[PDB]
Each structure stands twice: as structure tokens, then as C-alpha cells.
Write a protein that binds this ligand. Structure first.
Ligand SMILES: Nc1nc2c(ncn2[C@@H]2O[C@H](COP(=O)(O)OP(=O)(O)O)[C@@H](O)[C@H]2O)c(=O)[nH]1
Ligand SMILES: [Mg+2]
Length: 299
């Protein structure tokens, strides 16, 4: 059934295990704006895999392979949060090497994580087929995994099957990054769709319910802190009370919930400003926008 899936996955593992090889294989042609414009939030979008039936956004976690003295108290909190918000974890491991401390350090960080962890044995091309099941068993002694999938990221052996399996674990969801619009960085579409989801929870309906979200600005204030301006657009000012509510109470709750989901996923602390505006037809028209709503969220 023809029902579109989308989500956030993080590819974790020690250096030289194949993470960028995998990313660059599956994502296809690299998005141009991602190397013009730097991303304001912390947790870097690696790229966008779009098939007809699904879209996956690859997010960087912090270096959970690192020992605790190198990745501090704060960047652990960011890493554990990001791993919860994410839809799936790709734990990528070298088939051709013995288990080092870096993989034990990752296993420690995945202990009280409830997100699906996929064990991806990479570099199976450097190894006899009968070597895979013993190595799988080495890792299974440490923890349970959701699926175990041997690949070669370089050759492409078993990659498409891995993606088919990975897609089954995604929720139903929007195409975050579209084909029409090359101009803005995909982080803006991630924030835009998060805001929109919080609005559509309130609607919760099959009254025909048209609402839009624009993100007017995203600005890095610090390595932790980002300022988002966004305008929610509605038809009909009587949509106050779906969206603004009794003295702004409903718009605060949207602002609070969207701020949290942006902080947890993308790893930067936010100062969110939301506007709510009514848009009538604009083509050859004067005074088609009336504001009905403003909120401010932080700390
Ligand atoms: N033989 C083999 N080499 C691979 C495979 N995947 C990646 N490599 C190579 O192993 C290295 C891994 O580096 P990279 O992909 O940058 O991994 P990262 O540090 O995890 O991003 C590169 O020299 C890749 O060409 C694979 O499946 N088989
Ligand atoms: Mg590398």
C-alpha cells in the first residue's frame, strides 16, 4: 500500500569503518546548498536518501566511539538525547578487524536506548562468508540488536536489501526535502515539518484543513544556541481556537513541543519565535495577510 515513510537515522561507528562510503552510496547526487550554506544546528545532516515510497535524513550523533574524557558530560547528554529522538541507529562495524575498545564504548552508550539498533557488519568482501556468523556472535554477547545485516558499502553487496529492511522501521511521514526547491538548507525543512506536525495534532481531522509553515530565519548565536523565526499560515481567522486558543495557551503548547523536538533531534538549544497569520488570495490583491498570534520559547 502506497503510503510514504520518512525518518531520521544516525550512522555510528569507529573511524574507517565505512560510514561516509555508505552515506555517499545511498544518497545519490549530493545536494548543492549543503556545501554553500553551513548548517546552524549542531547535529549535521549527512544527506538525504529519497526513493518514491520513502525519504531518510542521515544525522550525525557526537563521537560515541570516543572515551569519556574526550567526549564530555554535555556531549554525552546530546548524544543520548539524539539517539532517543532518532527513528533508527546504524551501528557500523569492520568485518575484517578484532573488536576494540571503541565498539565497547559505543555499546555502553546504547545500553538504556529503546530506538532500534541495526548491527551493520561492513567490508564483508575482505572476509570468507563463514567468518560472518562467528563475528555476529562476538557482538551478540554484548547486547540485543533489532536486525543484523552484513554489507559491503564499497562493492554494494546487500545494500539495497539493507535499505528495504531499514524502511520497514520508519514511521509514516512527510517528504521533508522536496524536488521543487534547491535554495534553502534541509535543516529548515526539518524544523518546518516539526512545527506543522504539532499544528496537525490539534486539527486531528477530516474537515478539509489547509495550513502552511514558513521558517523565516535560522541563525547560529553560539555552538549550542540557535534562533528560529517561523510563521504558521492559516485560511480563516476563526482558526484561532484550533491554534492560538484561550489567551494564547494552545500556541504556547505548539511552541513548547516544537522547540523540544528541534532541540532533541538537531542537538542545538533553541530560541523559537512563532507568528500566526491569515493568508487570503494575494495575486493582484492588497491587504491579504492579518496576524492573529505571536509566541516566544526558551530555557
Ligand atoms: N574493502 C572494503 N573497503 C571499504 C568498504 N567500505 C568502505 N571501505 C573503505 O574503507 C575506508 C573507510 O572510510 P570511510 O568510508 O571514509 O569510513 P568512515 O571513517 O567510517 O567514514 C575507505 O578507504 C573506503 O574505501 C567495504 O565494504 N569494503
Ligand atoms: Mg574517513
Amino acid at each position: 500500500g502506497t503510503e510514504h515513510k520518512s525518518g531520521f537515522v544516525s550512522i555510528i561507528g569507529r573511524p574507517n569503518v565505512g560510514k561516509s562510503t555508505f552515506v555517499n552510496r545511498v544518497i545519490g547526487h549530493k545536494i548543492a546548498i549543503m556545501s554553500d550554506k553551513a548548517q546552524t544546528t549542531r547535529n549535521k545532516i549527512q544527506g538525504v536518501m529519497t526513493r518514491d515510497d520513502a525519504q531518510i535524513i542521515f544525522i550525525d550523533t557526537p563521537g560515541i566511539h570516543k572515551p569519556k574524557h574526550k567526549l564530555g558530560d554535555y556531549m554525552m547528554k546530546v548524544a543520548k538525547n539524539t539517539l532517543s529522538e532518532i527513528d533508527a541507529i546504524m551501528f557500523m562495524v569492520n568485518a575484517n578487524e578484532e573488536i576494540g575498545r571503541g565498539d565497547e564504548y559505543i555499546i555502553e552508550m546504547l545500553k538504556n536506548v529503546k530506538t532500534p539498533v541495526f548491527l551493520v557488519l561492513n567490508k564483508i568482501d575482505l572476509v570468507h562468508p563463514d567468518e560472518l556468523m562467528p563475528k555476529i556472535e562476538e557482538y551478540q554477547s554484548y547486547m540485543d540488536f533489532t536486525e543484523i545485516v552484513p554489507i559491503s558499502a564499497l562493492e554494494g553487496l546487500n545494500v539495497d536489501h539493507f535499505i528495504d529492511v531499514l524502511k520497514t522501521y520508519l514511521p509514516e511521514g512527510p517528504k521533508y526535502y522536496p524536488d521543487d526547491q534547491i535554495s534553502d538548507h534541509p535543516e529548515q525543512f526539518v524544523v518546518g515539518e516539526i512545527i506543522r506536525e504539532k499544528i496537525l495534532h490539534l486539527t486531528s481531522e477530516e474537515i478539509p484543513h489547509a495550513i502552511g509553515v514558513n521558517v523565516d530565519r535560522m541563525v547560529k548565536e553560539s555552538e549550542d544556541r540557535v534562533h528560529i523565526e517561523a510563521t504558521i499560515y492559516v485560511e480563516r481567522g476563526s482558526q484561532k481556537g484550533i491554534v492560538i486558543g484561550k489567551g494564547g495557551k494552545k500556541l504556547k503548547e505548539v511552541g513548547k513541543r516544537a522547540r523540544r523536538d528541534i532541540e532533541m533531534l538537531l542537538g542545538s538549544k533553541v530560541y523559537l519565535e512563532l507568528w500566526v497569520k491569515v493568508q487570503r488570495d494575494w495575486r493582484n490583491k492588497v491587504n491579504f495577510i492579518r496576524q492573529i498570534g505571536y509566541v516566544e520559547d526558551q530555557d
